[PDB]
Amino acid sequence: QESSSKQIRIHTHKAAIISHLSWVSLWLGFHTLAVYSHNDTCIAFNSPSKQ
Amino acid sequence: ALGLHITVLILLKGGLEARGSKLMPDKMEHSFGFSCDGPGRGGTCDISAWD
Amino acid sequence: AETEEGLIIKPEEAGKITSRDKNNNPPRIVVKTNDWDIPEYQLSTGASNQVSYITPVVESEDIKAWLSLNVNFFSIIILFTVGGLIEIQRFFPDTLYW
């Protein structure tokens, strides 16, 4: 429990770090792939202006 | 940014759980790189920090 | 229940019991098989007009219980959501209002 070392303080809440990193990774992947897929689908359908 | 976030996620998770995770709460007794922890306890392929 | 009048008899008295029925159907031999899906197979002793339904036994309660299974619930909701998206796309195409 001695929260003195920096690695100690990082390890105390390591689950929070990893969970938030997973959240931001999921957000970026979802919203980049989905917008790219929107553009791909709407430009395959002869609609460049629907991107 | 997605790629950087995920690379940092994998590396940071490996660093933080190199000394022990919920699945294998003795990981600092073993080497930095080791095969696995056996098929039991759910299966433990790619469990080391080297993995 | 469904065999309230069958004069059901055991293998040990295959040729001993003869009292037929409230109908004239001869007594039926009940064989206790170990299968859970067919716990008892009934065998006849002669010609008979026995009412053996081929329809299953379902009820509203356990049909609703099956529809309350997480697969059916989360498939009905997602099917309705996808259908609503498709209907919105048909009715308001190209998001002109945006």
Added chain:
Amino acid sequence: KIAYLQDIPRTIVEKDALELILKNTPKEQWENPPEDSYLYTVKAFAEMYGPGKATKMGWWDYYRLKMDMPDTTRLSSERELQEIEEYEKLMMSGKVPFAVPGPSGYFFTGFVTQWKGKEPFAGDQVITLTENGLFAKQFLSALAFYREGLKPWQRGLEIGMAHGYFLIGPFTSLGPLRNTPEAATVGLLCGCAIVGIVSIGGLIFGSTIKPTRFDKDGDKPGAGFIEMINWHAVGGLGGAGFAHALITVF
């Protein structure tokens, strides 16, 4: 005798079919047929239908019974049972009815090759025709590596002559200079190079593993193998040169 096998009506199962069942079924299972065995159904019905019991059945029940009994053709006859009882005896006795693979299958050659070797638990002593037949044994024993009475240099010389004579061909033909006016001295040089490389490998083997099966008594360990390898190099040179001489002259 067994109760339910007596006075069984022919309508339940025929006499010949019942005898065939009893023959196919092992004797110990007659009293209490197991389950899912035609004899089990015969017992479960002959104890319900018979002379002193229910003498009639519904048409559908009898129809289903007739499709649970054997149809007199799905049962092995006496000769087939003998075939199995003897094939299994052969297999368990360590002898294999010899068979040879063919076009997706194998033809039985009608031969009993004794399979288990002198050490029955040894995996590599299972004797086969291609390694333990008389011709195979005498051919392997008469090879230069194994021939009795050969000095190590003689084995090396013979093996080297074979290798050097053969190795010229792949280079002098279909080689980089296969169409040049010489086209064979290049092959000779390449074959001699291959012989030298494999001889160097053999020297590495003899200086690292050091086989001692060719050393005479009271000698430096591996000396016989080293002599064999050196004379293999000499024989490879000689065979390569002889093949080249034959190609050029003829």
Added chain:
Amino acid sequence: IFRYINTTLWAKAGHFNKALSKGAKTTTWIWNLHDYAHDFDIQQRSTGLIARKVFSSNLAHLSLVFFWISGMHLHGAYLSNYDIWLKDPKSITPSSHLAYSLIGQDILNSYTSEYFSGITITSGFFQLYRSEGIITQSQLKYACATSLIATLICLSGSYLHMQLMSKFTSFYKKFQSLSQDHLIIIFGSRSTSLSAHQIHKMLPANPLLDSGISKPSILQVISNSLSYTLALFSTNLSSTGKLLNPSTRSVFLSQVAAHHKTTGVVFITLGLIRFLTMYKSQFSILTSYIDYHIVLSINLALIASLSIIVADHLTRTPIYPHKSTSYPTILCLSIHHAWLSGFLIIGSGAHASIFNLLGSPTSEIRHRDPIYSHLIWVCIAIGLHSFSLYCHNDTLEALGRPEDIFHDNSIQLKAIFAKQSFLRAELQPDIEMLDKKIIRITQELGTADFIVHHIHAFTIHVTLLILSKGVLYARNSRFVSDKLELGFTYPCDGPGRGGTCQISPWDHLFSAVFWMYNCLNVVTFHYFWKMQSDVWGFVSIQKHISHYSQGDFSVNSITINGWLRNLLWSEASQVIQSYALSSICPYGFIFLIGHFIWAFSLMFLFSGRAYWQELIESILWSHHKLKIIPHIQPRALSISQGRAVGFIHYTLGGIGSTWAFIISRLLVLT
């Protein structure tokens, strides 16, 4: 009897397996429930229930196939341009498949006829209908009705047999009865029935269409009543297959009807012969192979082999009218059956392994080391030989030494047995053509064909090595001596003995699926390039031929760079430049999606489940922080499931990539 058919188990998921009775404590329970769904052997109750389940499930699947046939028939009757295709098949692409005008999906329908826009189907159902004398919409209506009736009948039979069959049921074990009745009544007595159907409905009809009367006086002539035409009206002597029908570019249907009649006669005579024929040698096979999994494996291997024979025989033995010119249809009919052959062969290997683990094996497993060792050596020999001739040609062409490569204009490896295999076909010394399109010309086999055939042999042998190694080393091995107790499918035996990952027969199938996929991707590419380069294409009135690939195969397929450039790059221009092009937009999109799925599989293929379990625990921390506790505890996929998901996504993505690549190009070119 049927009073026990109750819905009380519908809500109770996982009832069939006693390992799932503890309840859904973790998410692994869901995947196990889905995995054991059709594993009737390990499910609860006696062996009679296993037979009932197997037979009734077979009937249910048969009903499903009948429903699919009915759907195809209704699409052809009410959602197709089959009318104009009947009137002019050489100018109209088959299409029984439309797309709704939503999200601009209208761009997928393309011009197939002046009155029809839709997706060009390549199933070949229109050619089948024409060969089946189907002309009016009413005929397709009644075909769909009969298929729906068959669906209902088979569904009801599957429902009934779960209670008609009982503990005493034994009709499935009567293998003599099954073989005899199947053989005679189906292969013999139904083949002659189809011969009757053809003689009485095709020859009265298909010659009428070929005679130019697409009118057929409507029903005055088409509706039978044509007993003045004779059965062998236009056989034109010759030999079946030597002379094709000049109008439809196919074998005359009279010859097909005679073939079916004679094959039915042959099957009936074989059924009669089986009363006394050669036996007492396959008898050990007879007694030792009476089990569900062994007969399933045997049937899967047989059906897959028949599928590959169908794939090779549907393309250059033209049976269907107006089908040889329909190049996308020919390509699809070959390649789909090729893929099914590969998949069902792999399934046969898997069920051979399952039979070995459940039943008791045969004599061949005792010298398994020589078998699976000479197989190893032959695989290494033909891999280091077939492929490397490509590597040698590639290296020496890059070095600028074309005279040292393996080509026809260089060191040439003649296909001696194939060049001396003029036995097949044995056609006259020319080609056949219908309308600007080549029907069939003999594939002149050279060096490239030799090398690619050896590549095929090598890939087949390696896939067989994986399958036979899994089968023979299922019970035990020098590595692990109690593999039998470990079951059929297991991740490993542990990191001990150096590492025991993927020793189970299931993992051997897992690798064999990859190797079969790699095996017949080369088959697909060889066919797709060879046909375009050397068979298919336009014509010139001066007897000169202009193929689609302009003869690239014999000059480029000798090097791997040739395959990369002239097949995967130049012939991918149609699919890659397919955006906003009406017919081929979905093919470009599906090409992209197949790439995505194939790359997505690698996440499951390369990673282990422990990392994902730890990540899931890290996320579950945040979930527990906000009082969001999933009581079905989140667990990562099991090792075997991870491998299965990876393999499925890998094969699906790659198959989709090829599928789009070939179909879009053939639709554009045609």
Added chain:
Amino acid sequence: HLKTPILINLWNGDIYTPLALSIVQARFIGLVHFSTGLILTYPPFIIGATS
């Protein structure tokens, strides 16, 4: 190899026993191949496209 006529009388495998690569070694070798392929496939494309 221990069954081939000449090999068995020279090499019994007791010295440098051939074994399959261990799990960590296998993962590392696959990683090396993947990294080499992915990295070294690019410079040819760069040179072909720019030059």
Added chain:
Amino acid sequence: SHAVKIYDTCIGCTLCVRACPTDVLEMVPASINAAKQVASSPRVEDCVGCKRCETACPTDFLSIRVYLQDNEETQYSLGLDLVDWS
């Protein structure tokens, strides 16, 4: 050879002993649990490393722990069959 260690949390299941395929483990009397017995690993030189003992151990975290040592492998720890190292 690997390293198989038994910790005090053992409750005398005997499941680890039964799961071992090379008779590495054994039951010894003790007084630290209601079963009056704990596991022992007197013959870890025969431990292949399959970790079945760890699969069979029901304590919260395994009372028996197998530590893999790959730079330590002997012929017994590798399960060599075709080749003898003695």
Added chain:
Amino acid sequence: YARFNKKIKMIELRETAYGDRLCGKKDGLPRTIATGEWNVRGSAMWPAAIFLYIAGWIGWAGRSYLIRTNDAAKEINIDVPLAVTCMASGFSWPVAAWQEIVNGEMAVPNDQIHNGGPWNQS
């Protein structure tokens, strides 16, 4: 022909509807505004607000159902009346969630959930 006429009308309607939307001086493809403008054509503020509301609604309904069914049996066999009750009740999530945040009913102290693997002891 009629369906293509309808498609042409849709295309012309799209042309006239995107006229007020901003597009680059070199591409011609209309842009989406992500500056929080709230008052431009194609702004991302309105879709963001709508999605955030409905996503919080979904998450709140799921969390409410999980809290009110503290059992694994209720997750495989959904209590449909309670499930739809929570689904309808989720509309007030932006207020109820905040009232739980400030009143100590959403979060849980770290000393009540499994922190993670041990990193030390000796």
